[PDB]
Amino acid sequence: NVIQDLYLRELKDTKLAPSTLQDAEGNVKPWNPPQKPNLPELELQGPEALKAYTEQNVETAH
């Protein structure tokens, strides 16, 4: 009755205003994709290492 009148009128005559998209961006964290787990260096180099490892070793006790 009044229900029908109120509804018909309410829906029709009052148009939704959807939110500002900019504000939505604000309320989310923006995020651009993370980059690189890195390439870590090749452990040990030169005949410094070779000599060190061969020579230093004798680390068995008597």
Binding site: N1, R9, P18
Partner: protein, 50 residues
């Protein structure tokens, strides 16, 4: 997704002021008078059905 859910609530509050506006419109218009006459005859029919 969170802001989307918030927007659903916000839509309801947007629609809340729309209810207030529509209430003011019904009570403003001589629909206030003319639909009261409609209610009167509807009650006459209802009460006659008793």
């Amino acid at each position: 997704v969170r802001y989307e859910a918030s927007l659903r609530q916000l839509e309801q509050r947007q629609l809340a002021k729309s209810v207030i506006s529509r209430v003011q419109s019904e009570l403003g218009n001589p629909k206030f008078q003319e639909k009261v006459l409609q209610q009167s005859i509807s009650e006459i029919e209802q009460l006659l059905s008793k």
